[PDB]
């Protein structure tokens, strides 16, 4: 079946490059990226009334190439999933197709093909070009980015609220004070809404320049308020950046410990020992041939099941992190064992000599 094994190795390699890339497999995904992103850009260049002609021309070719490439990729991935043992036979392939992102990719492809077909309602045929962004959104494996951002935001919720509350009060105050000074002299600050627009555009440090204070009082107040206001607005970015950095550092820290080890290795052993209870040559002897006292072998199996369950638990626990108080715990164990050893010496000296 050497050909069968070559087939299986090819399948596993393709599935590895598609589902979970590593090392050089990226050279594929990046490509796909630059293929969709590029298309997006062209779509935007279609909106300008100056380049519409050439842009539509290029978009025709690019959409054709993209539809062909994504159809090929989809067929290849659906065939590759077969490598794993979970999805075998056409029933298994179907079970694979039922995944959400798979049907998403299929829907996007069928939409692209139907659009290019109807091309031969141009407004809708242009509007659906936004669909490609779903091809990128599909790159998120279970929304990792959203979950990471949410975790980091929640961990610093108290610090973030303080920056917004202090920043909002300064914007409401500085806007009011500057509006009070520029009310009549300058025409820009006709109403309070204009003052608030100016205050936001200034405190964020955007500084469009369509509204600026003209009288000296307004300038002094603006300069004094901007220094206090600019720092509060720029805090969230710094807080979140330091949070991300510290999180990455601590995580990388735990990589060195490698404490889980031994539990995973023992679990496979307890599972093999349990499994082999029912097929090992160790039980294919006249002695074991079950007819007179079946319970003996059943009792031996029951013990292996209990040990398997202990090993599965110890294995699952390894994932959980451990504290730095273990050193105190080993001293407690070491001292207690030694103190008990001196007692056992003391009792024997007192027994013999008295």
């Amino acid at each position: 079946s050497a050909a069968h094994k070559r087939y299986r190795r090819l399948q596993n390699w393709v599935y590895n490059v598609l589902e979970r890339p590593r090392g050089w497999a990226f050279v594929y995904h990046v490509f796909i990226f630059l293929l969709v992103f590029s298309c997006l850009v062209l779509s935007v260049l279609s909106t300008i009334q100056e380049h519409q002609e050439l842009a539509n021309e290029c978009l025709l070719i690019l959409e054709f190439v993209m539809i062909v490439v994504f159809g090929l990729e989809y067929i290849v991935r659906v065939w590759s999933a077969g490598c794993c043992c979970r999805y075998r036979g056409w029933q298994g392939r179907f079970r694979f197709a039922r995944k959400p992102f798979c049907v998403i990719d299929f829907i996007v492809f069928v939409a692209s093909v139907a659009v290019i077909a109807a091309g031969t309602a141009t407004s809708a045929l242009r509007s659906m070009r936004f669909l490609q962004i779903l091809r990128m959104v599909r790159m998120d494996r279970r929304g990792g980015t959203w979950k990471l951002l949410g975790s980091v935001v929640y961990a610093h919720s108290k610090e973030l609220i303080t920056a917004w509350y202090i920043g909002f009060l300064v914007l409401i105050f500085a806007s009011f004070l500057v509006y009070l000074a520029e009310k009549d002299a300058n025409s820009d600050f006709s109403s309070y809404a204009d003052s608030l627009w100016w205050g936001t555009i200034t405190l964020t440090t955007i500084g469009y320049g369509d509204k600026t204070p003209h009288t000296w009082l307004g300038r002094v107040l603006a300069a004094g308020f901007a220094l206090l206001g600019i720092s509060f607005f720029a805090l969230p970015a710094g807080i979140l950046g330091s949070g991300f950095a510290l999180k990455v550092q601590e995580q990388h820290r735990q990589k060195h410990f490698e404490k889980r080890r031994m539990p995973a290795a023992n679990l496979i052993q307890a599972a093999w020992r349990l499994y082999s209870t029912d097929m090992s040559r160790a039980y294919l002897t006249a002695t074991w041939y079950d007819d007179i006292m079946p319970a003996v072998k059943t009792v031996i199996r029951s013990i292996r099941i209990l040990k398997f369950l202990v090993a599965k638990r110890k294995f699952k626990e390894t994932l959980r992190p451990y504290d730095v108080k273990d050193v105190i715990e080993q001293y407690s164990a070491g001292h207690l064992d030694m103190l008990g050893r001196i007692k056992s010496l003391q009792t024997r000296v007192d027994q013999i000599v008295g």
Partner: protein, 146 residues
Amino acid sequence: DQLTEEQIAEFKEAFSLFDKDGDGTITTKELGTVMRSLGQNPTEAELQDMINEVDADGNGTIDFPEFLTMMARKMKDTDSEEEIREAFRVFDKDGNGYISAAELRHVMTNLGEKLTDEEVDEMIREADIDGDGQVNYEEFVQMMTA
């Protein structure tokens, strides 16, 4: 694989070897006594861990419903299949679902409760090893969970 009544009676007969007094429970005394009669030597803390895995009442005993559940289930549950597969993946750095026969042999005989040479020989014989010498452990996990 519906649990039949004759299968239940055979589990009951094994359960009664532990609980020879007919009290309907297995403590560390009953469990450890049967084990040492076969030449095993568990510690007290190992006997407590074993009973604790199936003792829902938390009173340090195994009753027949808990015994029957463990025996009917073995490793067939989805939790067992996933955790065993996660254990192999610890030793699969490529992430391709493969492990070398020689690497499996090293881990089985050098870590943990090491397998003997004959144990590990039977284990590598049972996995349908490829011609390269690489083992697809996820189909190895389904054979132990079937």
